[PDB]
């Protein structure tokens, strides 16, 4: 007896899921439009129903806003609109958060109830590298204290307050640092998806997850994430590591054997301990847990019972 | 710009609230049965409308359950019924949590959508005095670690899972200890109200508030709670202190002037510090913050924006 409705992938496919409603030409185009070999049979068979489920929560919240506003006789201090519905997305580095978040963004946007869907990563709230050196935290990049938690919280509070303007900084996955002066502006979207390692973490007072209406945790076996983490590092030889500007340049040259060793070391010393200590404990706090197989595909969904 | 809608009592009074909700007399008689010398003005102008706000949220959550169930084609994995809607109620010792909760319980029960409204206090989750001594924690009774947190979490998790049978222990307010072998049985109510000092307290991992659907914080100036505390202390001389085997009997025979001094001192060393350190910081985590005047009447309501 547990707080989850659990489905494996078979069962979830085996449906009897009221109206189907398919993806268009068109919508499938735009979804490879970000398609790092993004599996479209997975988008259609897992992510789309999952997006409908969430849509039911967004729609219910919009109708609550209205039943509540009507009851109070719409006073001058109640907002005219629902404030943004915020969805958190948590999980290890290299688990596919970003893809999950990007797919959901694209799918949720197709409803008339909420076509304006934003996506912000908390990576942009990490302290800049120089700032991090100054605090003796470089070896702790991506641990909770590596983020400007106060700015992170002010941002989400601003969005949840029905502000019309809220700005976050930006983090380069090329330079592995904050890009000075770059900014992402959010403008009272109907939905904000907030993606990051730390979004479901707790603190002593009001924490950002207090401002979430729904959250996901992307899960997998820790040996599988290590493998995806390694592959991603290797593939970086061709891309980000290829620039001589990079602090990781000397890595371009490494053979598959030596790049592995260098990767398995950052995993072991930084990302794995971060996962075990700080990220995985936040997993039972999510509304929905998606567990991925070694081959990247979803094999299990746990949804909090309603 | 802030995450809640604010009404002072004058603004709450300019109150074009849609439904003239029908209060019998009858029900008002029951309502006197919990005399914190309860003001029936208060019930009529404040608690009733609030209970309607809360009702909206239970109703929305109930219908969301059904739309979601129908969307999944009501599979075997899904429960047949919504799980209990859980309301947390926080605030200092002596602030009026218990009364507030007893009143919402009576008001909420009168909708047919949700007639079975349970009330549990987390006081039953304090370690028995015996255990507290064994831990060197007696002078910390009411502080976070004085509770069996694990057991509390297991209790709320069981209720949120849709268990038929969940049990809390009971804490005597006459013997100021856990009552051995005594248990309160909760049987899948439509609404559980969970009341206590620590309900909106934060933990490293899954906290009880993660399982709340709504939460209330009863607030007042720190001086005003002292006064209520002292009076409640004076009033126990005849009742709970009359007990000869009570570890407080030696207070029964205290004159007024002398009992004020003992009370103001115990306030200063256990309950006031607990409020500052552990209870007051949890305040902005509540969905609703009610602030009471010295007269026990609401002068400020703060509701999370929807
Ligand atoms: C400590 C550092 N972490 C980050 O930059 C970071 C911090 C917070 C959130 C996300 C990230 C990361 F950019 F994906 F790595 C890091 N961890 N591994 C690396 S090597 C490049 C790399 C990044 C991500 C990955 F999945 C594989 C390799 N780096 C530079
Ligand atoms: C440390 C002790 N606290 C409790 O028993 C307690 C612990 C957790 C939750 C609630 C309570 C209390 F029973 F309400 F005090 C306490 N603090 N003041 C007292 S004196 C009795 C008393 C209780 C409450 C009150 F408002 C006035 C007097 N006592 C026995």
Question: What does this protein structure show overall?
Answer:
Chains A, B: It catalyses: (R)-pantothenate + ATP = (R)-4'-phosphopantothenate + ADP + H(+). The structure is a homodimer of 306-residue chains. The radius of gyration of chain A is 20 Å and the shape is globular. Chain A has helices spanning 9-13, 27-32, 40-71, 97-108, 129-133, 149-160, 222-236, 256-279, and strands spanning 4-8, 85-91, 117-121, 166-168, 171-172, 177-178, 184-186, 191-195, 214-220, 288-292, 298-304. Chain A contains 8 helices and 11 strands. With 306 residues, the first copy, chain A, is of the alpha/beta class. In chain A, the strands form 3 sheets. Chain A has a 7-stranded mixed β-sheet. A two-stranded antiparallel ribbon of chain A has the order 4-7. A two-stranded antiparallel sheet of chain A has the order 5-6. Chain A starts with a strand and ends with a strand. The first copy, chain A, has one domain (1-306): P-loop containing nucleotide triphosphate hydrolases (Rossmann fold), CATH 3.40.50. The longest helix of chain A is centred in the N-terminal third of the chain and has 32 residues, at 40-71. At the A-B interface, strand 1, helix 3 and helix 6 of A face strand 1, helix 3 and helix 6 of B. Bound molecules: the ligand C[C@H](NC(=O)c1ccccc1C(F)(F)F)c1nnc(SCc2ccc(F)cc2)n1C (2 copies). One copy of the ligand C[C@H](NC(=O)c1ccccc1C(F)(F)F)c1nnc(SCc2ccc(F)cc2)n1C binds at residues 93-94, 123, 126, 141-142, 173, 176, 197, 229, 232-233, 236, 266, 270-271 of chain B.
């Amino acid at each position: 007896p547990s707080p989850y409705v659990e489905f494996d992938r078979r069962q979830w496919r085996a449906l009897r899921m009221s109206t189907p409603l398919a993806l268009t030409e068109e919508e499938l185009v735009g979804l490879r439009g970000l398609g790092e070999q993004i599996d479209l049979l997975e988008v259609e068979e897992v992510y789309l129903p999952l997006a409908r489920l969430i849509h039911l929560q967004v729609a219910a919240r919009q109708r609550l806003f209205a039943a509540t506003a009507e009851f109070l006789g719409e006073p001058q201090q109640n907002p005219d609109r629902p404030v943004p519905f915020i969805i958190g997305v948590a999980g290890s580095v290299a688990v596919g958060k970003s893809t999950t978040a990007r797919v959901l963004q694209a799918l949720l946007a197709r409803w008339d109830h909420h076509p304006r869907v934003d996506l912000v990563t908390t990576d942009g709230f990490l302290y800049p590298n120089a700032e991090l050196q100054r605090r003796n935290l470089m070896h702790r990049k991506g641990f909770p204290e590596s983020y400007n938690r106060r700015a992170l919280m002010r941002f989400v509070t601003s969005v949840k307050s029905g502000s019309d303007y809220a700005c976050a900084p930006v983090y380069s996955h090329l330079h592995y640092d904050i890009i000075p002066g770059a900014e992402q502006v959010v403008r009272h979207p109907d939905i904000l998806i907030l993606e990051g390692l730390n979004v479901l973490q707790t603190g002593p007072t009001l924490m950002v997850s207090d401002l979430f209406d729904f959250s996901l945790y992307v899960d997998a076996r820790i040996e599988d994430i290590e493998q995806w983490y390694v592959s991603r590092f290797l593939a970086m030889r061709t891309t980000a590591f290829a620039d001589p500007e990079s602090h990781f340049h000397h890595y371009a040259a490494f053979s598959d054997s030596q790049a592995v060793v260098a990767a398995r070391e950052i995993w072991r010393t930084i990302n794995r301990p971060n996962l075990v200590e700080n990220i995985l404990p936040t997993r039972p706090r999510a509304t929905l847990v998606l567990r991925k197989d070694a081959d990247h595909s979803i094999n299990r969904l746990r949804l909090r019972k309603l």
